[PDB]
Amino acid sequence: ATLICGSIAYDNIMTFEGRFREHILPDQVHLINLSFLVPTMRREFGGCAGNIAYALNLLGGDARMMGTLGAVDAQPYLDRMDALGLSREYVRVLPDTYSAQAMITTDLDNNQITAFHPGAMMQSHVNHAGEAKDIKLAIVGPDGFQGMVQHTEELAQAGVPFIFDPGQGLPLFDGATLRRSIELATYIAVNDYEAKLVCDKTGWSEDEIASRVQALIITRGEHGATIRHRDGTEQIPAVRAERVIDPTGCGDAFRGGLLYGIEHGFDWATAGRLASLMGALKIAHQGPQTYAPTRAEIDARFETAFGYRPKGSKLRSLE
Amino acid sequence: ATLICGSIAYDNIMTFEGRFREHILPDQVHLINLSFLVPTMRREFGGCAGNIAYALNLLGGDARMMGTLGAVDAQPYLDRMDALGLSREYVRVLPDTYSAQAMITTDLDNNQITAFHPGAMMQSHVNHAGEAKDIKLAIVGPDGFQGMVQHTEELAQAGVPFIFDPGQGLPLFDGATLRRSIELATYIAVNDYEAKLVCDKTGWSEDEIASRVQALIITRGEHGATIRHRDGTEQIPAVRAERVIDPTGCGDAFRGGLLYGIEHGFDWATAGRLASLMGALKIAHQGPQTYAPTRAEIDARFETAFGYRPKGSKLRSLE
Ligand SMILES: Nc1ncnc2c1ncn2[C@@H]1O[C@H](COP(=O)(O)OP(=O)(O)O)[C@@H](O)[C@H]1O
Ligand SMILES: Nc1ncnc2c1ncn2[C@@H]1O[C@H](COP(=O)(O)OP(=O)(O)O)[C@@H](O)[C@H]1O
Ligand SMILES: O=c1[nH]cnc2c1ncn2[C@@H]1O[C@H](CO)[C@@H](O)[C@H]1O
Ligand SMILES: O=c1[nH]cnc2c1ncn2[C@@H]1O[C@H](CO)[C@@H](O)[C@H]1O
Ligand code: NA
Ligand code: NA
User: Could you say which residues bind inosine here (chains A, B) (predicted)?
Assistant: First the structure.
C-alpha cells in the first residue's frame, strides 16, 4: 500500500474567472485591487492528503491517509472515507479540536492565495510514519511542520521511498531543513513556482537537486510537466481539459497518478502522462475531489490523448 | 446632511502579515502560491457606505446612508445603525434577500482580492438619490452597477455635488459610462491603482480627468495622497500609524474625513490631512469600523501630526 502523509481539511474555494496576471500593476503602490462575484459558499472535502489519496483510490491503488482531523467536526470526512473504501487506520481524530480549514482564493492559472486555519493539523506529528505496516511507497505533503519533518526522517529510517511534496508548507522550512528533506527524499514533486522557491531556500540549482533524487518532477499548469531522471528529462504534455472550472488540487490529482505509476512500474513517460491526465480530469469540476471517473473512463481518455493504454512495464529484466 | 451612496455589507477579512509583492514571480506559470495562518473567522460591519458613514459620524457629521440590505440578516446592522445614531431613512431592507457579503483577502499594502456575494446590493437602484431631502453633498461609492449610474444621474439633476468613488465597482463600467460619470461628478476619489484603471478605461489622462472635476484625489497608502485642484496640487502626508493591523477600509475612513472637510469649508491641505489621519487611525485596528476615536482624540492627533487644529475656513470672502 501507499502511505499518504499530509493535511486533511475542509476547503472553501473562491474562483476568479480570469487571470490575476492581467490585473497586477507593479508600478503602483497598490499592485492589485480586484473584486469578483461569487455564488454561495460551499465547503468541499480537501487537504493535500485527502486529495492525493482520493486520486490514487480512483485509479485502484491502495491509499492509506496519515493525517490528523479534529473530533469536533471530523464526522462527515470519516463517513466519506468509509463510503469510498479509504482506510482510516492512520487518520487520527483529536479530541476537542477542529479540523483544518482552508479559505482558498484562486484564479484560472491556479494562483492560490490561501488563508489556512490549521486546527488539528498542528498536531500531525502524533502519527509515526515509521510504524505504518505494508507500505511500499509514500508521499510527504503539506502538513504541520513538525509532522512533515518527522515523516521524512521516519520513512527514510524505515527505508520506505517517498515523494517529497512541500507545497504550501514551504515557508515553514529553512535551508538546512529543506536540504535535509531532499537528501532523504527519493522523488520531489513541485509546481514551477514551488521549484523556484526550493532552489532559492536550499541555494541549490535544479541540477544539484536532481542529483539527490531519482526524479525531480515540476508541474507547469496548462503547459504540462517535466520529469527529470537519471537518463533524461521527459516533457509531459498537458491533456486538453474538457472545461476549465477550478484548478484547486490539480497538483494533488497529478500526484495520485504519479504514485500509481511508480507503484506499478510505469515508465516515466507514462507515469507522467497518467498524472497529467488526472490533473485535466480534476480541473473540469469545482473542488479538489468532485471529479469521479471510473478506471475504464481514465484509460479511454488516456488512449484518446496519447495513442496507447496506460499500464506498468511488462519487461522482466534483472532490475 | 451628506448622502452616502454605496454598499452595506458584512465583511470576512483575511490579513496576510506581509506583502504580496515579495511573493509574486512573474516569470513562472504560477506567479503566486501563498498560504498563511489565520485565526477564527469573524464577521465585521462593512460595505463602502457603512464605512464612509461611520467615519463621517465619528467626526460629528450628519451621514445619511443610502444602500440596500437583505431582510433575512439585516438586523444586527440595523441595530448597530440605531446605536450609533445613523439614520436609516435611506437604508432599504429588501424582503427574503440576504445582505451583501465580502470575503476579503488582503496584505499589509492593502492589495485586496475580494470574493463578493452581492445579495441585496444587486437592487441598490430601488433607492432614488434625487428624492433625498436636505442633502448638501454626496458620495457615490461601490454599489450595484445600475444603482451607481442612477445615483450619479439623479444627484447631478438635483444639483447635489458629489464625490465619485467607483472603487471595486470599476470593472462594471465601460468607457462611455465612466466618462459620463466623471463629467457629472464634482470630485473624484480613487487609490493609485484605481486611478490608472480610470485613465485606461476612459482613455483620458489625469490632466483631462482633472479638467472635469473640482478635485481629483488619489490615495497612495502609506505614501499619503495627492489632491489636484484648480490652483495647485496638495501633497498630503501620511500620518504614521500607531501599528499596522488591517488596511481594509482605509480609503473609506479617508473619504469620511474628506466629506467632513468639504462640508465645513476646510482648505484642501487640511481636508486632505484630516482624511489622511482617519486612514491612519483606522489601520491600527482589525476591520473597517473597529477604530472609535472621539472627536477630541482626532483633533489632538491631528495637532500632533501637523502642528495646528483642524477646522473650516473662517474667511468671510465674497465666494
Ligand atoms: N488548464 C489546464 N489544462 C489541462 N491540464 C491542467 C491545467 N492546469 C493544470 N493541469 C494539469 O494538472 C497538473 C498540475 O497542475 P499545476 O497547476 O501545475 O499544479 P498545482 O496544483 O500543484 O499548482 C499540470 O501539470 C497539468 O497536467
Ligand atoms: N500604512 C499606512 N500608514 C498610515 N496611513 C495609511 C497607511 N495605509 C493607508 N493609510 C492612510 O489611508 C489612506 C487611504 O489608504 P489607501 O490604501 O490609499 O486607500 P484604499 O483603502 O482605497 O486602497 C492613505 O492615503 C493614508 O492616508
Ligand atoms: O498551508 C497549508 N498546509 C497544508 N495544506 C494546505 C495549505 N494550504 C492549502 N492546503 C490544502 O491544499 C490543498 C490543495 O493542494 C487544498 O485542499 C487545501 O486544503
Ligand atoms: O465589489 C464590491 N462592491 C461594493 N462593495 C465592495 C466590493 N468589494 C468589497 N466591497 C466593500 O469594500 C469595503 C472596503 O472599501 C469592504 O467593507 C467591502 O464590504
Ligand atoms: Na534524496
Ligand atoms: Na465633473
Answer: 7, 11, 35, 47-48, 51, 116, 168, 252
Q: How many angstroms does the Cα of residue B276 sit away from the middle of ligand 4?
A: 20
State in Å: Cα A118 to ligand 4 middle.
27
CB A167 within 8 A of CB A185: no
Determine contact, residues A256/A288, Cβ cutoff 8 Å: no
Contact yes or no for B34 and A220 at CB 8 A? no
Give the DSSP letter of residue B23.
Answer: G
Instruction: Please give all residues whose beta carbon lies within 6 A of any atom in ligand 3, as ranges.
Output: A 7, 9, 11, 46-48, 51, 102, 114, 116, 142-143, 168-169, 248-249, 251-252, 288; B 35
SS3 A51: helix
Q: Hey, what's the torsion of the CAs at B134, B137, B141, B144, to 10 degrees?
A: 40
* Resolution of this entry, Å: 1.7
Q: Among B31, B35, B36, whose Cβ lies nearest the Cβ of A111?
A: B31
CA A205 to chain centre: 23
**Residue of minimum CA distance from atom 1 in ligand 1:** A222
Q: Are strands A63-70 and A2-5 parallel, antiparallel or unpaired?
A: parallel
Task: Enumerate domains of chain B plus CATH numbers.
Answer: 1-319 (3.40.1190.20)
How far is it, in rounded angstroms, from Cα B114 to Cα B116?
Answer: 6
Does residue B85 belong to the interface with chain A, where contact is any CB pair within 8 Å? no
Using CB atoms, pick whichever of B30, B103, B171 lies closest to residue A109.
Answer: B30
A92, β-bridge pairs: A68
Burial class (CB in 10 A: 0-12, 13-18, 19+), B119: buried
Produce one character per residue of A54-88: b if its CB has 16 or more CB atoms within 10 Å, e if not.
Answer: bbbbbbebbbbbbbbbbbebbeebeeebeeeebee
Nearest alpha-carbon partner for A287 in A57, A104, A77: A104
Q: What does DSSP assign to residue A101?
A: E
- What atom of ligand 4 comes closest to residue B44's alpha carbon? 17
Confirm whether A252 is a catalytic residue.
yes
- Reference A280, options A134, B155, A272; nearest CA is A272
Q: What is the spatial distance between Cα B105 and Cα B15, in angstroms, rounded to a whole number?
A: 6
What was the structure determination method? X-ray
Q: What does DSSP assign to residue B100?
A: E
User: A280 CB under 6 A from ligand 1?
Assistant: yes
